[PDB]
């Protein structure tokens, strides 16, 4: 095994990754959904500014 497994696994699993994760897209969407202070206070400032 020390030859057989390691020849592949040491060599290739060296370089594992690159992506702009779709899971991070999920995170971004969620944080947008759950920036309460952003949505609510923007909406309230926008409306409440107009007084007639």
């Amino acid at each position: 095994x020390x030859x057989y497994x390691x020849x592949x696994x040491x060599x290739x699993x060296x370089x594992x990754x690159x992506x702009x994760x779709x899971x991070x897209x999920x995170x971004x969407x969620x944080x947008x959904x759950x920036x309460x202070x952003x949505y609510x206070x923007x909406x309230x400032x926008x409306x409440x500014x107009x007084x007639x």
């Binding site: 497994x5 290739x12 699993x13 992506x19």
Partner: protein, 371 residues
């Protein structure tokens, strides 16, 4: 045209078109090579052998096993296997169908990237997908919520799935699968001390795992019966050669799942892992899962697992609330069956990878695009 799915859930390997009830045929993913000087000059030397062909030929062949711990060990060997499977069983050309790939969840990107890279380049194939086991398990079992346990040839799983969504934090993933258990078996077996170690010799155990195992109802009480009785003990032949007759050594084996001391680790076991992973997940859902509890494949084949599991949950659950588990007949096939369903729906036409993307962007595409 038509659409084709490979199962690479480990153990024998399962492949079939969308809408057939069961895959055409199935192969272990053994790989093996010669061990001795080739001394019939009349013989053609082939240097690598796979599948039931090898399963016959085994004795002078020696095995390599191209998937450890659900991680596929050596790519070019896989490519040999894969090529063989297409041409010899399937009589299929890579252009012919979209092809669907079956993955351990939560495991290193590399398997994604090379698998796709090879199969789009080495094979040239209209559409590709890789899918996580539990999804198929639900689709086949047809309950949109659930939790799945499927401990195959390879790394052993807990996923709760709620209807229509993943809880990837919730998920637990374990290298406890039956192969390593079997290799523990030998360290049992030397007690009776009929004893042999090599790969083929190890696979011989697999038959016994088919035939001779059954699940401990209660461990202490079983020991008491072990002192009382020999009906616990059954008599079995070598595949050829001797009759062999086996005591508690049969039932002791599955307990490892409940107690992975015997080859020693800490993760508190299938059931305690499950309830742990529940208690991670949130409060209200839980009843459904108490209702909807689902199991499949290699280990589950054993008679009785579901019962002691339920005993365990009745230990850990507040008894007040309903509990049951599902134990379908077909579990070992379940995944590929679900894959067939998965293949059926037109939405993957929206969803498949196409060659074009692989042209325009790398393997990186997958990890956004798929789960």
């Amino acid at each position: 045209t038509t659409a084709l799915v490979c199962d690479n859930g480990s153990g024998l390997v399962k492949a079939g078109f969308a809408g057939d009830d069961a895959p055409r045929a199935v192969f272990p993913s053994i790989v093996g090579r010669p061990r001795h000087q080739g001394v019939m000059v009349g013989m053609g030397q082939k240097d690598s052998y796979v599948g039931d062909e090898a399963q016959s030929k085994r004795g002078i062949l020696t095995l390599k096993y191209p998937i450890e711990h659900g991680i596929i060990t050596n790519w070019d060997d896989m490519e040999k296997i894969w090529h063989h499977t297409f041409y010899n069983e399937l009589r299929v050309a890579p252009e012919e169908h979209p092809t669907l790939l079956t993955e351990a969840p939560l495991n290193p990107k590399a398997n994604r990237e090379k698998m796709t890279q090879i199969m789009f380049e080495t094979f040239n194939v209209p559409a590709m997908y890789v899918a996580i086991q539990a999804v198929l398990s639900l689709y086949a079992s047809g309950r949109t919520t659930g939790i799945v346990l499927d401990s195959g040839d390879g790394v052993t799983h807990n996923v709760p799935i709620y209807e229509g969504y993943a809880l990837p934090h919730a998920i637990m993933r374990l290298d406890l699968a039956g192969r390593d258990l079997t290799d523990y078996l030998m360290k049992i077996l030397t007690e009776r001390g009929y004893s042999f170690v090599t790969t083929a010799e190890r696979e011989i155990v697999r038959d016994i795992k088919e035939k001779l195992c059954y699940v401990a109802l209660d461990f202490e009480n079983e020991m008491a019966t072990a002192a009382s009785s020999s009906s616990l003990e059954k008599s079995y032949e070598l595949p050829d050669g001797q009759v062999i007759t086996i005591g508690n050594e049969r039932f002791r084996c599955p307990e490892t799942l409940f107690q992975p001391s015997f080859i020693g680790m800490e993760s508190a076991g299938i059931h305690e892992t499950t309830y742990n992973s529940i208690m991670k997940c949130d409060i209200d859902i839980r009843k459904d899962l108490y209702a909807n509890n689902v199991m499949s494949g290699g280990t589950t084949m054993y008679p009785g697992i579901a019962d002691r599991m339920q005993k365990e949950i009745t230990a850990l659950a507040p008894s007040t609330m309903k509990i049951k588990i599902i134990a379908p007949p077909e579990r070992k096939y379940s995944v590929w069956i679900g894959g067939s369903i998965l293949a059926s729906l037109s939405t993957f036409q929206q969803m498949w990878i196409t060659k074009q993307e692989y042209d325009e962007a790398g393997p990186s595409i997958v990890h956004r695009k798929c789960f």
